Amino acid sequence: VVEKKETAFIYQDPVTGEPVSYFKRDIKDVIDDLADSGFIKIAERQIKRRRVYKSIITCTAVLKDKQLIAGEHIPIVPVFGEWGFVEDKEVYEGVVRLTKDGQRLRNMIMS
Amino acid sequence: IITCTAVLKDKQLIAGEHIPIVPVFGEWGFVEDKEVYEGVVRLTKDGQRLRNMIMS
Amino acid sequence: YENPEVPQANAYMLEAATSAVKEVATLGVETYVFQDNLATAMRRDGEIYQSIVNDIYDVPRNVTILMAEVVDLATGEKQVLNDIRGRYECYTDVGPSFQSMKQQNRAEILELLGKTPQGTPEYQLLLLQYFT
Amino acid sequence: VFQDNLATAMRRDGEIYQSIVNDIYDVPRNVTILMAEVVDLATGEKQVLNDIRGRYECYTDVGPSFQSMKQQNRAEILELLGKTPQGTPEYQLLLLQYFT
Amino acid sequence: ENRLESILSRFDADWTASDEARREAKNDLFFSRVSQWDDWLSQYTTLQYRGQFDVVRPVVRKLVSEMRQNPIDVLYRPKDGARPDAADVLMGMYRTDMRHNTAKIAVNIAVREQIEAGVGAWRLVTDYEDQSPTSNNQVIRREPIHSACSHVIWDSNSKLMDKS
Amino acid sequence: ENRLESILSRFDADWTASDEARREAKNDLFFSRVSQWDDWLSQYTTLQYRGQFDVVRPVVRKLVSEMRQNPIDVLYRPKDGARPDAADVLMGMYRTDMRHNTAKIAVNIAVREQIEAGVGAWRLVTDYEDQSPTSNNQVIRREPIHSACSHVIWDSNSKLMDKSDARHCTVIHSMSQNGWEDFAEKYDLDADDIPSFQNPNDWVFPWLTQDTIQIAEFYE
């Protein structure tokens, strides 16, 4: 995720009001089509936003470099159980860990 | 912003009338001009350490 | 020859180990903390989904004079969505899982019906439940 | 006791937040004649907030956590409804609950 | 200067930072999913009776079942001062493109891994749909990540539970 | 006369004043989070059975669950003689910029550390937002502080539970190499000159790498 200030255009909606469109999203595709459709530019600002880039990599080379993907956030959602930091070291635990020692004993004795 | 040998940023004024850090305490007090705070785990450390040893 | 016997140490330690695992394998008292962590994860999921929707989806702007979907296509026939910066008009919360908006409306009407006394609003809500 | 200590911490948090809000945010002054936001911009196009010294008009307490003002209003209306007998104010509060 | 070198440096730092937690989580998954006699280093020495008399699996089953009985989903609510219908379209889209089996399965997998190991994850992807598009000939779906302890490696300089 | 000398003298006095409490809190965190066999000083002598049969962790889980079911938040109320609509704007701002996941996570972290160790903390910071600003193109968020026993050092001449009488406070930041680079980019520091400060952690567990860079923020 890269957070940067990018250009945005303040047009005037032919129906009503004035809109804000990011310059990168209509950079070349329709940048001249707004004028034909009745949108005229009234202002240009610099607005800060985040962009997400994905790269496909292996241990020796980069296949895809900086493929821009949709969204302002990394699309992975994590879920944690008992989560914390001890000494700048993240630790997460469920319900099985603390029972491993006793159970391993119960298996041994029964064996 | 400081290190052990130099000052990087000197007196950057920040917003507010208070230090922006909020502390939360458990059992808090002073014994002899010495602040002591305790949770729930400390007093159980001695017995549990025994229970771990005996079962071992 | 003496009959085989399980030593007292073996039985005592098996019982003690089983009791220890029984006592330690109790999440919470209930999984309220785990459910709250899942709720935090779903709030993050909703944030990400809202960002993606603003990026790629066609979000209409509701005028008070009606949804006015303003879009246009390029010379390459590709349509480019035009989303205004007044996009973060709603925030994220955690609620029951519903497969459709009609199910959510039905649940809301039923919830309201369970608290309204049998007056005129009760009749209104009953007719509204028969509506959906 | 731990919840009380957390409440003390949240009261300190509210104090710090109020100070920061007075420092940087735009706090409107409500007139009884409406919120009048009085600000101005410099020659460098930067707007500087103008906050009067009549800023500490509210104090800090501890209450339930609500995601927005609408949720808080709904909770208050429901709390009032649970204590009001089924008279005219009960109908008033029911209509107000359907309001929000 | 090399892009691959910088990416690999970041990945190696993050991978080495979280080695112990990942190892413990993988051990937990193996213990609760495959076998409690995790004796891979020395098992081909002699043949002796090793029985698995499980005592923890009923607890895991109970916790997973109880967490399954209370589904949790996103709910979009209008902001303060916004139009009261500000979240109807977004909520409709979310319910439209999250009603499929993949989203429920991903959430269930993440929940089970969270209960057993301590961490799970899922992913949000977008694709082009021509038959039943949600909008703009596109769909957003949710996909599962199995063994998120070792398959998802986060930035080591993150101090938030949701890694925002 | 030297500013660095005065800052370091204050920090050293505060650090030495609270050494025992910090050590005990760190030991509590290690005991309740990593392992109850805190035998780092002499463990590589011989291999003997050391089993962990936990009996305190269910209590900690129960207390954390109990404190989680009852959230607590600020509530601004009009003063005596003030207009009854004195606190709606401030309350709206607070609910607007404290509804995010970061605030809840910071509060939960502080509460868990308070239950386990005895002390926790969080921070309030302000940033510039251009997309969804709360007011004046700015937002206020709440950030977490992990292991507040050793990372937040307060003025030793403070006799209040919330430390509102404290006149200075030093927060120690430990961060990765990429984290340090982004910190330097954010605060316009020199990324080539790696900083250093008093290390609050202890290399006790057999962690493969505890590679961290330490800096300090001194508030007065």
XYZ file of C-alpha atoms in Angstrom, chain D residues 20-57:
38
model
C -6.770 18.539 21.087
C -10.161 19.324 19.526
C -9.991 22.884 20.832
C -6.454 23.113 19.436
C -6.942 21.868 15.874
C -10.600 21.209 15.101
C -13.297 23.675 14.032
C -15.669 24.071 16.987
C -18.795 26.074 16.048
C -20.305 28.508 18.531
C -24.063 28.042 18.891
C -26.056 31.284 18.954
C -29.596 31.550 20.315
C -30.831 34.169 17.828
C -27.641 28.290 14.764
C -23.959 27.341 14.576
C -21.664 30.176 13.454
C -18.313 28.827 12.251
C -15.995 31.852 12.199
C -12.677 31.131 10.460
C -10.354 32.799 7.974
C -7.554 31.880 5.581
C -4.118 33.460 5.309
C -2.343 34.640 2.165
C -0.759 31.181 1.940
C -4.256 29.697 1.452
C -4.007 27.986 4.862
C -7.141 28.313 6.989
C -6.565 29.043 10.685
C -9.245 28.030 13.168
C -10.650 30.739 15.447
C -11.797 29.213 18.748
C -13.027 31.472 21.543
C -11.948 30.954 25.149
C -15.488 29.819 25.987
C -14.477 26.283 25.035
C -14.688 24.239 28.264
C -18.487 24.213 28.273
